[PDB]
């Protein structure tokens, strides 16, 4: 069965610099070694879910080297949006530790939005939980048009974050493919 929700906070956090780092050679076993490092990265991110403060976070899937998660699938009334941002900071703490041991400079680029979504499975093969909707499309656009080391949020999302005590900055007005002109913000660290 497919359930409908009203307020869900979706998130996409990419590592743009990976695609370049990945190369297929005989020394690195046709690129297997590069995938071994991603497996370490994605694994470090995953164990944050075991922390008590992140019990409300749901890892949906992993697109490439992009980590997709969402909060509010279990339902200070809007705290779930503020929490997703807290998780964004945590992924940076983890990605930075990976940098310290692999002598790299990988930086995270985040995009968060919120709204109505549709949860459930799809197709005829495997029981894979996924969330759909415009809310999810925009979150992904908030990540693809973002800046490294920044959490880009939509306008509506900016309001809610401010109420919870967060500060924001106006990225400007950019044309998002398919959606038109949206005004976006950048959460202040």
């Amino acid at each position: 069965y497919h359930q409908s929700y009203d307020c869900v906070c979706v998130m996409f956090a990419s590592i743009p610099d990976f695609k370049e780092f990945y190369t297929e050679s005989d020394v690195n076993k046709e690129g297997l070694e590069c995938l071994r490092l991603l497996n370490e990265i994605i694994a470090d991110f995953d164990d944050l879910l075991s922390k008590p403060k992140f019990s409300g976070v749901e890892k949906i899937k992993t697109i490439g080297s992009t980590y997709m998660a969402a909060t509010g699938l279990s339902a200070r009334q809007y705290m779930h949006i503020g929490t997703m941002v807290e998780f964004a900071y945590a992924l940076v703490g983890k990605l930075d530790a990976i940098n310290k041991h692999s002598f790299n400079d990988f930086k995270l680029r985040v995009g968060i939005n919120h709204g109505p979504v549709i949860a459930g499975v799809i197709g005829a093969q495997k029981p894979q939980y996924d969330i759909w909707g415009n809310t999810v499309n925009v979150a992904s656009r908030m990540d693809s048009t973002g800046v490294l080391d920044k959490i880009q949020v939509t306008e509506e999302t900016s309001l809610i974050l401010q109420t919870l005590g967060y500060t924001c900055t106006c990225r400007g007005i950019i044309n998002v493919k398919g959606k038109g002109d949206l005004k976006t913000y950048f959460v202040n660290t």
Partner: protein
């Protein structure tokens, strides 16, 4: 049995030279392509010294105003794409290399970026200039060419295979090392002991030996090398002694802690080794031992070796000692 060895260390420590010894010792048309590389070292050495003369503080002056014209020459061809290397070049170079000023500037070469094979190639210009010139084994050892990317080298010592991996030691290169961490028999960390009075190329401020120490700590305490042992090569042992005995650049002026240091009891000096030298080389080793002592007990160890990579004779000795460590420990 097969062993996979990875060479780690900062830029110019002596990694690529160690692989050239494995070829000379256990592996062995191309020798003619290295000529072009050797001539480049020569060109880069002369121009770097000359160009540095006016920038030092205080500026060093030529002893023969005649050479001022030759100075003008070297510079006019500094960044020329493909230099044909005419007979004039070698002449100008040689005259400059004999000028006391150019020599005084060379003595203070630790204050600007200069290649290690400088004094060696400049001393044999009359040999490299010939058209019938054939590079010696020692010539290839000294020749310098930056390493970029990863390189594998397979060899054999008494029907036992060894895969050697050579990587770039410069900051930007380090990011590829990770690709070899998994399934490594042991690590060979190389250090430029003689580089205590120099600075790295990347920023022109961080002390070279300190960059080595920090890098070692980063490798020793790495989360993916928790059980991999490290064979430490305190390379450039020849230049360390020459520097210590010359007394121009004092070791305690860079690393203050030296003043409160005495040679250890278990110290085994070389026959005919100066007390000053002994005390110096063991000091540098102890710095790296202080790091390896504090962590990863029993899981992995560190084995120090005094090394001079361009001494085909010395490398046989210490590599056979390594072959011992590897087999004796079941690695």
């Amino acid at each position: 049995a097969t062993h996979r060895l990875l060479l780690l260390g900062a830029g110019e420590s002596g990694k690529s030279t160690i692989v050239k010894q494995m070829r000379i010792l256990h592996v062995n048309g191309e020798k003619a392509t290295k000529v072009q590389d050797i001539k480049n070292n020569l060109k880069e050495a002369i121009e770097t010294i000359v160009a540095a003369m006016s920038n030092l503080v205080p500026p060093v002056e030529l002893a023969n105003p005649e050479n001022q014209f030759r100075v003008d020459y070297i510079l006019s061809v500094m960044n020329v794409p493909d230099f044909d290397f005419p007979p004039e070049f070698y002449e100008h170079a040689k005259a400059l290399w004999e000028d006391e000023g150019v020599r005084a500037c060379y003595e203070r070469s630790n204050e600007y970026q200069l290649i290690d094979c400088a004094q060696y190639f400049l001393d044999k210009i009359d040999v490299i200039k010939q058209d019938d010139y054939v590079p010696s084994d020692q010539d290839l050892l000294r020749c310098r060419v930056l390493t970029s990317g990863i390189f594998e080298t397979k060899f054999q010592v008494d029907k036992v295979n060894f895969h050697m991996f050579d990587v770039g030691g410069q900051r930007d290169e380090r990011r590829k090392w990770i690709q070899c961490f998994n399934d490594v028999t042991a690590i060979i960390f190389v250090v430029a002991s003689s580089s205590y009075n120099m600075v790295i190329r990347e920023d022109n401020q961080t002390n070279r030996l300190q960059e080595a120490l920090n890098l070692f700590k980063s490798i020793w305490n790495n989360r993916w090398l928790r059980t991999i042992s490290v064979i430490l090569f305190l390379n450039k042992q020849d230049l360390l002694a020459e520097k210590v005995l010359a007394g121009k650049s004092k070791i305690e002026d860079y690393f203050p802690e030296f003043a409160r240091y005495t040679t250890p009891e278990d110290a085994t000096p070389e026959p005919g080794e100066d007390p000053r030298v002994t005390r110096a080389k063991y000091f540098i080793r102890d710095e790296f031992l202080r790091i390896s002592t504090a962590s990863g007990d029993g899981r992995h160890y560190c084995y120090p070796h005094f090394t001079c990579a361009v001494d085909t004779e010395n490398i046989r000795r210490v590599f056979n000692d390594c072959r011992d460590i590897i087999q004796r420990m079941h690695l």
